[PDB]
Amino acid sequence: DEETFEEFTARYEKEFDEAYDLFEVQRVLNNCFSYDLVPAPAVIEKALRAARRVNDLPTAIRVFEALKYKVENEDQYKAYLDELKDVRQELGVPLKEELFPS
Amino acid sequence: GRIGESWVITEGRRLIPEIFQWSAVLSVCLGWPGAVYFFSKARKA
Amino acid sequence: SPLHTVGFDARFPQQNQTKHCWQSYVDYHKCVNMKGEDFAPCKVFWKTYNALCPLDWIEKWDDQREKGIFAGDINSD
Amino acid sequence: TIAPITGTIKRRVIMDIVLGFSLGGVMASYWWWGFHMDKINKREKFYAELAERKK
Amino acid sequence: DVPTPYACYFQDSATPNQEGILELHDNIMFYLLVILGLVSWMLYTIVMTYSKNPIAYKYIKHGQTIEVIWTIFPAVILLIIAFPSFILLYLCDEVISPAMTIKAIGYQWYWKYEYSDFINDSGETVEFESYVIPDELLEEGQLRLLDTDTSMVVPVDTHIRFVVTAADVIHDFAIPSLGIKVDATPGRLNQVSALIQREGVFYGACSELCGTGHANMPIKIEAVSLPKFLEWLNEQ
Amino acid sequence: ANKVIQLQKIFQSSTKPLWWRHPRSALYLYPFYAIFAVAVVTPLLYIPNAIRGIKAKKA
Amino acid sequence: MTHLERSRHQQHPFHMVMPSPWPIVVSFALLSLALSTALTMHGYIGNMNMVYLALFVLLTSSILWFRDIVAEATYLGDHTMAVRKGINLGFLMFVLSEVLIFAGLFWAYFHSAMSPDVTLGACWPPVGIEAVQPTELPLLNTIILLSSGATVTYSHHALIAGNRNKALSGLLITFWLIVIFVTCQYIEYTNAAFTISDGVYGSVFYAGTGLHFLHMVMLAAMLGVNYWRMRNYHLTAGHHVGYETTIIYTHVLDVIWLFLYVVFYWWGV
Amino acid sequence: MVQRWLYSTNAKDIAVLYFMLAIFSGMAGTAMSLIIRLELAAPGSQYLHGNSQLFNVLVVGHAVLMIFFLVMPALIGGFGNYLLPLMIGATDTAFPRINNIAFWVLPMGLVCLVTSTLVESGAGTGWTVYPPLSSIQAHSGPSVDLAIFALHLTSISSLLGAINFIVTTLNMRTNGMTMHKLPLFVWSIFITAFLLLLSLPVLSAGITMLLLDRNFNTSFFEVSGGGDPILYEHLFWFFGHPEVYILIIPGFGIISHVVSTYSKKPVFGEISMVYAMASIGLLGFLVWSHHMYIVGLDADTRAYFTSATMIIAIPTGIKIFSWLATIHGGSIRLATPMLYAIAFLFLFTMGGLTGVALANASLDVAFHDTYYVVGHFHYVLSMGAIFSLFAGYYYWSPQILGLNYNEKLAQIQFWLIFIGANVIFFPMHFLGINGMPRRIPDYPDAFAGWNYVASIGSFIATLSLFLFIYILYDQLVNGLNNKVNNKSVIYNKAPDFVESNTIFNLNTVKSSSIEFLLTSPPAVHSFNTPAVQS
Amino acid sequence: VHFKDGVYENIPFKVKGRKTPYALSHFGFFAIGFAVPFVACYVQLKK
Ligand code: HEA
Ligand code: HEA
Numbered sequence A: 001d002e003e004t005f006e007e008f009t010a011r012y013e014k015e016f017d018e019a020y021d022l023f024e025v026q027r028v029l030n031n032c033f034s035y036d037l038v039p040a041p042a043v044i045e046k047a048l049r050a051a052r053r054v055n056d057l058p059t060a061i062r063v064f065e066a067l068k069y070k071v072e073n074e075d076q077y078k079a080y081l082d083e084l085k086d087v088r089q090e091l092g093v094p095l096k097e098e099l100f101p102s
Numbered sequence B: 001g002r003i004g005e006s007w008v009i010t011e012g013r014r015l016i017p018e019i020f021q022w023s024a025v026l027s028v029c030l031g032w033p034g035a036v037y038f039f040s041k042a043r044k045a
Numbered sequence C: 001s002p003l004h005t006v007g008f009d010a011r012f013p014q015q016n017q018t019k020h021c022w023q024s025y026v027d028y029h030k031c032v033n034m035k036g037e038d039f040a041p042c043k044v045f046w047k048t049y050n051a052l053c054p055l056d057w058i059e060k061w062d063d064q065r066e067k068g069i070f071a072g073d074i075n076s077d
Numbered sequence D: 001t002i003a004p005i006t007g008t009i010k011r012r013v014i015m016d017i018v019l020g021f022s023l024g025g026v027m028a029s030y031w032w033w034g035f036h037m038d039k040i041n042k043r044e045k046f047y048a049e050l051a052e053r054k055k
Numbered sequence E: 001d002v003p004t005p006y007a008c009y010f011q012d013s014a015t016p017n018q019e020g021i022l023e024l025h026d027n028i029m030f031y032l033l034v035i036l037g038l039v040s041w042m043l044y045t046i047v048m049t050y051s052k053n054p055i056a057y058k059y060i061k062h063g064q065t066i067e068v069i070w071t072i073f074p075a076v077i078l079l080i081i082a083f084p085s086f087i088l089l090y091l092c093d094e095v096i097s098p099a100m101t102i103k104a105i106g107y108q109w110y111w112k113y114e115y116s117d118f119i120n121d122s123g124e125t126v127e128f129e130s131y132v133i134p135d136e137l138l139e140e141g142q143l144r145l146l147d148t149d150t151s152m153v154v155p156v157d158t159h160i161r162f163v164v165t166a167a168d169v170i171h172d173f174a175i176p177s178l179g180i181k182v183d184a185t186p187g188r189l190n191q192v193s194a195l196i197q198r199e200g201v202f203y204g205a206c207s208e209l210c211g212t213g214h215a216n217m218p219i220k221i222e223a224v225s226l227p228k229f230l231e232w233l234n235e236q
Numbered sequence F: 001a002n003k004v005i006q007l008q009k010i011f012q013s014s015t016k017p018l019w020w021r022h023p024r025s026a027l028y029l030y031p032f033y034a035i036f037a038v039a040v041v042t043p044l045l046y047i048p049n050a051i052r053g054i055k056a057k058k059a
Numbered sequence G: 001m002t003h004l005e006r007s008r009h010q011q012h013p014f015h016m017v018m019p020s021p022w023p024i025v026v027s028f029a030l031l032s033l034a035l036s037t038a039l040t041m042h043g044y045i046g047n048m049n050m051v052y053l054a055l056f057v058l059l060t061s062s063i064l065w066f067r068d069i070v071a072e073a074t075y076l077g078d079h080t081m082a083v084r085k086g087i088n089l090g091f092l093m094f095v096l097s098e099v100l101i102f103a104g105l106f107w108a109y110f111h112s113a114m115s116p117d118v119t120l121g122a123c124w125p126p127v128g129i130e131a132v133q134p135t136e137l138p139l140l141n142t143i144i145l146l147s148s149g150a151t152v153t154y155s156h157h158a159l160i161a162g163n164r165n166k167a168l169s170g171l172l173i174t175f176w177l178i179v180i181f182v183t184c185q186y187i188e189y190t191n192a193a194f195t196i197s198d199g200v201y202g203s204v205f206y207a208g209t210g211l212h213f214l215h216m217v218m219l220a221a222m223l224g225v226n227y228w229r230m231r232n233y234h235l236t237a238g239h240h241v242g243y244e245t246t247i248i249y250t251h252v253l254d255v256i257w258l259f260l261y262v263v264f265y266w267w268g269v
Numbered sequence H: 001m002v003q004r005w006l007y008s009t010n011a012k013d014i015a016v017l018y019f020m021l022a023i024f025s026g027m028a029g030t031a032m033s034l035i036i037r038l039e040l041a042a043p044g045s046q047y048l049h050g051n052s053q054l055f056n057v058l059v060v061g062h063a064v065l066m067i068f069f070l071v072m073p074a075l076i077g078g079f080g081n082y083l084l085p086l087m088i089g090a091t092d093t094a095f096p097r098i099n100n101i102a103f104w105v106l107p108m109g110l111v112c113l114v115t116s117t118l119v120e121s122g123a124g125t126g127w128t129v130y131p132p133l134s135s136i137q138a139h140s141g142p143s144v145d146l147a148i149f150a151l152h153l154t155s156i157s158s159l160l161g162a163i164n165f166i167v168t169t170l171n172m173r174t175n176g177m178t179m180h181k182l183p184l185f186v187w188s189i190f191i192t193a194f195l196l197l198l199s200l201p202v203l204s205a206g207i208t209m210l211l212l213d214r215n216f217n218t219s220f221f222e223v224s225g226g227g228d229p230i231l232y233e234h235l236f237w238f239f240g241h242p243e244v245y246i247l248i249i250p251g252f253g254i255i256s257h258v259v260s261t262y263s264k265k266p267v268f269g270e271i272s273m274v275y276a277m278a279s280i281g282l283l284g285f286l287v288w289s290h291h292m293y294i295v296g297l298d299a300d301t302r303a304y305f306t307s308a309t310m311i312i313a314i315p316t317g318i319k320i321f322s323w324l325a326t327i328h329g330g331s332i333r334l335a336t337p338m339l340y341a342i343a344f345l346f347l348f349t350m351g352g353l354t355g356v357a358l359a360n361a362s363l364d365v366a367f368h369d370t371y372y373v374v375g376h377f378h379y380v381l382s383m384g385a386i387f388s389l390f391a392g393y394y395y396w397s398p399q400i401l402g403l404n405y406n407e408k409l410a411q412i413q414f415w416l417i418f419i420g421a422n423v424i425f426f427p428m429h430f431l432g433i434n435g436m437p438r439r440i441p442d443y444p445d446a447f448a449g450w451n452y453v454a455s456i457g458s459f460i461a462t463l464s465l466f467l468f469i470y471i472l473y474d475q476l477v478n479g480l481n482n483k484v485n486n487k488s489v490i491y492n493k494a495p496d497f498v499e500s501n502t503i504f505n506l507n508t509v510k511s512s513s514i515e516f517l518l519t520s521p522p523a524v525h526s527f528n529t530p531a532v533q534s
Numbered sequence I: 001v002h003f004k005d006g007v008y009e010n011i012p013f014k015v016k017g018r019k020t021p022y023a024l025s026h027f028g029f030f031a032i033g034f035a036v037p038f039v040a041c042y043v044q045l046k047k
């Protein structure tokens, strides 16, 4: 409802900037997924960087599953494909190719 | 870039089973009195 | 009734007619109880009390007049 | 990477409500078609039985 | 008439008042049915869709569009379902020359119908009881628990006034077939304009408790032609 | 007055029930209820004991 | 030490009340009274003395609770501003329920304004039914009651201001006026207006007047209780839980009496 | 046990007594209504050989116990005195002797009804006490007087409970809570307190004058003197219409609470819903004579009353849309209180819309005092009292007592009682639409199969109640063994699907009600320092 | 009133004691509940 994405986005990166442990990361991630606002690739990269800082790969698994299935978005795929591949090959967090064939 | 939907495809393929199931549920909930009426000797049958 | 007595009714615009029989009976009992010769002044609402009004009220009012304690508020004549 | 988001806030409930209203209306019409047919048949029978005895 | 077994609708209409009442009732039922179907399908689709919802949309509180939509819709819905009610009340409640007037008093577990509009031999007031035939003393072929030894008659294609009252306990003049249902106050009277256009026998019972022996309680109505009514009047 | 403070101090020192105000009245009223109400409610069901049992069965 | 006890007894205006038998005994008294009245008015025994004693002991229990509700406010104390406001609002809602009772009694006969009904009444004024009307007969008492209320409302204001010899004069005047009121009520014991045989128009007025004769008895009993309460001199011009109740009662009863006197006396006559 | 239980002065120790009285009364009333339905399965004296006065007295007892003796102590008293002071944070409610005297004034009502049914006179005038049928002219004996005293004591207890609720809410509410953030259930009970306060005195006075007429050889409303019972029936309807709102509004509050907590999302405009309940409570007084269209009053009065009814219907629909928005767009866990809430929002809504259709001024000619009106109010009574009580029990029982319940047993119980209630109450509308009378032990031979299906549904419902009391037994006897194993759910709040379960150890039970954040039930005078909200 | 742990004191029951294994009391609850309907039916008529 005529709400700017930039303000809440910048709030998200600023919150992830001081990620001392996983609690604030988790709460901010839950808040971001609470809205209908589909997260941008930039905030997803920031979240993965914070998860790397706090060293919890399962949190990365959870967020990747959430991005795979959060809202229908008219069943968009290639957007999901690019938004996953850029952050997979930016630094390397191999997790998706294991839980699926198990 | 409007990938896939085209709302109509998934919209129909998802609601049609649901509306059919709900119609069947209502049909059963209205035919159980009809089942009782049929089973009872309403017409000495 | 031979399917035709008055036709259209427009005496009282509102639907409810609880307070209708008093006015339509006081005049009838008046015109009966002064002259008794010609009923022309009250010759137009014969059915307003015979069939259009509960005859139980009519019979109770007649019995009250016989006993002298009328339901309505009228004079002694 | 589609920039336009937040458009899913309201149209889901709007389409759900309008489709529910349409389904209710068409279902009620389907039920009431037979009821109205029976009512008209009964009315026609009433007129026939009232008019046939006088003449 | 007789309550049809396994019925799920109204009984057979007998008067234009009843057919108008049924028309209003089904007109109201149409909108009520669409509303209940809407809400039921809403509930069903919610419980079917969001039962598997992983993340809750917990930051939605305003919804102005739906708010105004379902704030303005109920008003017009109520207006469009109330207008036929008012027009039917105006049509039926009209005092269009009631032609017949008889007493209907609710006594103690019995009724004493008095016919004072008409006479029997010369000026006399016709009056008779209506006692329910006991179940043990029932004659073969009768209706159980309700049939009476003698009932009241009524002309067809006329207008009838039912003067309803009681003696000691409040009763009810409830006749669903004829579309008349007026309480029987012990001391206060009321006038209801009942007009009959179709022949037949219409049943009915007092829809108000009369103490204990209220299960064996007769109100039977028989509609007759003008020659039939005259012959009955001469016989009575 | 001249007894309020002392009585309050005594009550605080001796935290006992009955509030010390009306012990004789309480001892007079306690047995009266048991003597009266029980003995007046017992007939209410004792007398209709022979009256009870009206089956009024009919066939 | 002070902080912990202040926190543990500050928001707790409720005492550690002993296993008080008041609810069970009052319930037992009411049940005994109810069954006794039911058995006596129509039953097997027509005894009257012992049911009178049961009513007497029920009234004594009620009086005991009523005197405790004001004794524990001073002797026990342990009250704050919040609980005082709670008691005041409770008394306001009791007098509001009494106002609703009076409103129902008034509506029992006040809805017949323009005669909307047809038979069995529906005639304002009821011409023809002219018995000894209870209207304008006790107005000689109503006017002096209004005068007494007007002259004692400000006396009780001065009471709550100072609680001094002027308060004593006010309370003795109140005793005198309530004694006069109960005397003139008891003088019209049997033959006040008429008895209920037929034509119930003033009998409803008589019953409505009679059923409110217990509020004045309760007020007089409370006034005597407060008189003894001040005679003990424990209740100073402090937690006057009875003085506020009596001033609000005398400030509402005059208003409701004037509301009664507005109609039913010069309306329809 | 006499030293602390029979002589209690604690809301904590009296709420459980309220609950025990409520469940005992409910089970006894269900067995007695079982008898009523069983003797009505077929026409004739299948089980009641004559004595229709006995059937009438059975009906009066059923209705009275369902209305004033079962549900009033449960959600008004039992739930109020264990939730409102707990949510406030105050140590104890103001002057608990009010609560104690309100509780202890009930049982002699039960004994007076049982002894009145025992005697040959009986009270067979219906739950309504319309004169002169309840006077000495028709019904003699002390039964009428006993019923009058029972209703008087119930009214006094309800008034005392409202007194306690009002004083606790207004005088010693916690600093953190304010007017603009007060929760829903306490607003519901406060509005119910207003309605009860403004409704009790009219019944008290009118029934007092009826008793005086029966005793003083007089008659204010009976014809013997010139009175008219229509005035008393206006007064009785003026009392009765707010009563259904009194019994339905705390149900609205608890249902709002459970749906708000089970949707994992906050409320949908709490200001709008509290305005809705306030409007319902204020508008409940404009239809004082809407239940009495049968006399034949002026058409303008009937039009005004039907306009008032259609105005009253609007806030209920808005509040229903509010629950629907609350459940929309939120995570759903199919736990049993949610099943009760869904059954409510379906069947209560259907019953209310049927009543709205019935609310027409001229439509009482075919439905009033028939089986249609009983099919109407049985719907709402079952939804807002029976199912609401079941939801509240299964929603606070694991913490208010620390004892859990078998989830499988709860699910099968809900299914059984739901299908039983549906199959019982649905055919009653088909009986009513025909025009059958009410309050008759024997009926014509037209709708026998519907009576038979109602009887079998009643047997299903009573078997469900037997299973429910067995569930109560099992919870009271095997709670410790059920907690350790997987027989029941120990966390009504599954963690969000973004968070690990190890962090969840500190996030066990988090909602918008303080008593859930409390540990196992502490001593009665808990809450040493009142809670503060920043 | 502060001498109770907060486990089973909230109900007038007692696990300890061989007089009633919560079965005599539960049967008695059934008995007192089913009293009024059956006695009401029996006092003026048959079950
Ligand atoms: C609480 C409200 C309540 C409940 C639960 C019921 C339960 C039932 N009622 Fe009744 N009834 C009334 C309120 C209620 N009723 C009222 C007010 C009247 C007015 C009298 C009149 O109209 O003159 C009435 C009258 C009435 C009549 C009128 C009889 C006649 O015409 O004279 C009939 C029969 O048709 C009937 C049937 C039933 C049936 C089959 C059930 C069955 O559902 C019984 C099975 C029980 C349930 C399925 C619910 C479980 C109940 C509980 C108590 C659960 C216990 C646990 C908790 C409470 C936590 N009821
Ligand atoms: C739980 C108790 C309860 C509740 C909640 C209700 C709620 C309602 N009741 Fe009922 N009622 C009774 C208990 C109850 N009632 C009892 C005991 C009787 C006496 C029977 C007897 O005498 O034997 C009775 C009788 C009764 C009568 C007279 C029938 C009679 O007894 O002869 C009428 C009709 O005027 C009526 C109407 C309503 C309406 C309109 C509501 C509504 O408030 C319902 C609220 C819910 C809705 C209205 C749903 C919201 C609707 C929408 C989704 C919007 C759609 C409509 C618009 C466009 C606004 N009730």
Ligand SMILES: [Cu+2]
Binding pocket: H241, H287, H290, H291
């Ligand atoms: Cu109402």
